Coordinates of N, CA, C and O in Angstrom, one line a residue:
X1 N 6.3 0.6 5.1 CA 6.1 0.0 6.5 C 6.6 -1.5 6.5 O 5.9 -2.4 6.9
X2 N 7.9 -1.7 6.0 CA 8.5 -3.2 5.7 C 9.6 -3.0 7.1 O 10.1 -1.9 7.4
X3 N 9.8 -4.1 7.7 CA 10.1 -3.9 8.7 C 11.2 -5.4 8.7 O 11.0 -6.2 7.9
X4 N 11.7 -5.5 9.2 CA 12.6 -6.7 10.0 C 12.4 -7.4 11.5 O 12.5 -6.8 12.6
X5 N 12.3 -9.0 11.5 CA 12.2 -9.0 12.9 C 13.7 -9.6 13.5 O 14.5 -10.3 13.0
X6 N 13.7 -9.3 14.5 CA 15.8 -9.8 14.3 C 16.6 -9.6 13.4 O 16.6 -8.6 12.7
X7 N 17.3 -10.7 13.3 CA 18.2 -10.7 12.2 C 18.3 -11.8 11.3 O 18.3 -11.9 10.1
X8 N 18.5 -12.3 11.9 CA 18.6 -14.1 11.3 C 17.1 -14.5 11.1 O 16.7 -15.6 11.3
X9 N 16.4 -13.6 10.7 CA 14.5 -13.9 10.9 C 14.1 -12.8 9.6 O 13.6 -13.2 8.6
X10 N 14.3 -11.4 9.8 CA 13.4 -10.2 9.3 C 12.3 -10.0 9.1 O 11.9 -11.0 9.7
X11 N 11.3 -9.5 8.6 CA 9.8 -9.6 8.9 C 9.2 -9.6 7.6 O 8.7 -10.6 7.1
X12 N 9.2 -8.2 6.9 CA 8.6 -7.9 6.2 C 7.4 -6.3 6.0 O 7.9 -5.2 6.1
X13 N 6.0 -6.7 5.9 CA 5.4 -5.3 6.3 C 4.3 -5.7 7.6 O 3.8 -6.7 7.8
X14 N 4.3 -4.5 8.3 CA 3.6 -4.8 9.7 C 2.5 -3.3 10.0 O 2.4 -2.6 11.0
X15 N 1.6 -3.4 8.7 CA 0.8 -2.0 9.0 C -0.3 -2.5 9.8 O -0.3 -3.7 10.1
X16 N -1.4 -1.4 10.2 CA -2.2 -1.5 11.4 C -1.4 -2.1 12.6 O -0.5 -2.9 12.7
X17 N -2.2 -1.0 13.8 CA -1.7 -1.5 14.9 C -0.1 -0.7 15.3 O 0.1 0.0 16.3
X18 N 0.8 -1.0 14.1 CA 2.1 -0.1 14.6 C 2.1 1.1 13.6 O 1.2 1.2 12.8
X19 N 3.3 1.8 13.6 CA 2.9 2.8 12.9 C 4.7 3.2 12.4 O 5.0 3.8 11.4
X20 N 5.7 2.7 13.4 CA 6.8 3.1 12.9 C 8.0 1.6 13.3 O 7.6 0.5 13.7
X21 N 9.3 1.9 13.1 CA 10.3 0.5 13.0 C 10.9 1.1 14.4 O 10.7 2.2 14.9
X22 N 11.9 -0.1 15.3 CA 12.2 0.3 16.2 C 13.2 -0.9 16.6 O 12.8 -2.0 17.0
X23 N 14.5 -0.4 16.5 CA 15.6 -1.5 17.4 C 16.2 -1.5 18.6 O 16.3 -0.4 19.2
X24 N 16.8 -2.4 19.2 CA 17.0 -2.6 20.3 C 18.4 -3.5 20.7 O 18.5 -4.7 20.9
X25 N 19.2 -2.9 20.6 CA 20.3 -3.8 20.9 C 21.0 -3.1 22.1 O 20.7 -2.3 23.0
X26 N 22.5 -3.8 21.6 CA 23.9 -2.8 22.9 C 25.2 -2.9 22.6 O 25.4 -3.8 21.7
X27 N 26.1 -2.3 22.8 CA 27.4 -2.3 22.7 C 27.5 -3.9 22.6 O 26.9 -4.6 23.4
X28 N 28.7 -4.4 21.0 CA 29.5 -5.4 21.7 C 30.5 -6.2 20.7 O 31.3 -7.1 21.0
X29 N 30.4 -5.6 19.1 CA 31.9 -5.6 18.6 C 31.8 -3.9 18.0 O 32.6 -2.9 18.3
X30 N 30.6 -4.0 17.1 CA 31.1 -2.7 16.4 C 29.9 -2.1 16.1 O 29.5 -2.1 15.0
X31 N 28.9 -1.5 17.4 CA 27.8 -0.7 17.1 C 26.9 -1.6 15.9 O 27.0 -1.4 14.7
X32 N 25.9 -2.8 16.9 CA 25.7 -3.5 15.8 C 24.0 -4.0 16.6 O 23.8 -4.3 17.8
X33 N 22.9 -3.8 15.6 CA 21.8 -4.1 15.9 C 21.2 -5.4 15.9 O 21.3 -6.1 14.9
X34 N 20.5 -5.8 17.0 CA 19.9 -7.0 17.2 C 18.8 -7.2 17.5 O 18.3 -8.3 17.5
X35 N 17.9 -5.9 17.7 CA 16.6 -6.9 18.2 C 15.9 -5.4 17.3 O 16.4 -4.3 17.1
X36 N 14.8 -6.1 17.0 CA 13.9 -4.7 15.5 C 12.6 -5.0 15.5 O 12.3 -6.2 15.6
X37 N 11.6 -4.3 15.3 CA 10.4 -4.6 15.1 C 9.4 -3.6 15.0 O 9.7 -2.4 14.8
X38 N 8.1 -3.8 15.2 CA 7.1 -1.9 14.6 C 6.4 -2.1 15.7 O 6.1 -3.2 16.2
X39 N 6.2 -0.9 16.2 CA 6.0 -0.4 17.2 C 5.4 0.8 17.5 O 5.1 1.3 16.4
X40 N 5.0 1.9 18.7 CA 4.5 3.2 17.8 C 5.4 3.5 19.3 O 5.5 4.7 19.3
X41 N 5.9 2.9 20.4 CA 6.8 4.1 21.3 C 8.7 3.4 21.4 O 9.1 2.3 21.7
X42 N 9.3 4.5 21.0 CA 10.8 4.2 20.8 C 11.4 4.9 21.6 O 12.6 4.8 21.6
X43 N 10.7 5.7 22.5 CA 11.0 6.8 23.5 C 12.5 6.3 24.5 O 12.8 5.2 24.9
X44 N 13.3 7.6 24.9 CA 14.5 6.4 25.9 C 16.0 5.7 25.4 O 16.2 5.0 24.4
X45 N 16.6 6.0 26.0 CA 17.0 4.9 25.7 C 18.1 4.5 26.6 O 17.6 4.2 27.7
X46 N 20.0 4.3 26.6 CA 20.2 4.0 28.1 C 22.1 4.5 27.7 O 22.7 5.5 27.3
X47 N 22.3 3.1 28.0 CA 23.7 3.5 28.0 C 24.4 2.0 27.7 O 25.6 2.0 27.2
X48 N 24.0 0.8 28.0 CA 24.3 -0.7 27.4 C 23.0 -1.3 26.3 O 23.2 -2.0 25.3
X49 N 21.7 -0.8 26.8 CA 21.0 -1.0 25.7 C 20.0 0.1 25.1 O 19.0 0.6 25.6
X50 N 20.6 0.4 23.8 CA 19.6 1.6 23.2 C 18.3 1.1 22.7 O 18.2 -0.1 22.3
X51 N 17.6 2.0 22.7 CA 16.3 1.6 21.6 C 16.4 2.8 20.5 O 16.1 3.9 20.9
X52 N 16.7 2.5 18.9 CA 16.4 3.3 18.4 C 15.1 3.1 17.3 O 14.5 2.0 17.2
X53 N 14.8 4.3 16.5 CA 13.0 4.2 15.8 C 13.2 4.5 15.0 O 13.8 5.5 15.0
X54 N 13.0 4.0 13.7 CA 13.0 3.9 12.1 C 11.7 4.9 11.7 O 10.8 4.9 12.5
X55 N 11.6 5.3 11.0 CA 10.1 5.4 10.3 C 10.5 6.1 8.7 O 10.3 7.3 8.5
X56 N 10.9 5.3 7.7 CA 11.4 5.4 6.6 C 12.1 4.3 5.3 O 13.2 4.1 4.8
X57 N 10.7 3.6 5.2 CA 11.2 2.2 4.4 C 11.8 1.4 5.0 O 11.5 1.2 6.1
X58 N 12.7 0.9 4.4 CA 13.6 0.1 5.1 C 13.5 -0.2 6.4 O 14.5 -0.8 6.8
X59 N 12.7 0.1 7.4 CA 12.6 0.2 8.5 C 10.9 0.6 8.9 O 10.6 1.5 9.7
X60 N 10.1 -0.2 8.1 CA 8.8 0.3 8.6 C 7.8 0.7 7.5 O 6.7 1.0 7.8

């Protein structure tokens, strides 16, 4: 459950309360992530900003 917050930041572990990792960025050189954090809904997502959900180390 180690997680990252941003990028230029990263987090660390974030148990209780969330349960999985989850980012949030958008197109704009080369399929590249920007916003991250634990969370328990990743549901959705779009077409300029996705949200995608980690749940496997490196991500939670």
């Amino acid at each position: 459950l180690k997680c990252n917050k941003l990028v230029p930041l990263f987090y660390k572990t974030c148990p209780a309360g969330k349960n999985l990792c989850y980012k949030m960025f958008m197109v704009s050189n080369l399929t590249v992530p920007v916003k991250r954090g634990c969370i328990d809904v990743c549901p959705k997502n779009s077409a300029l900003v996705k949200y995608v959900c980690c749940n496997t180390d490196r991500c939670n």
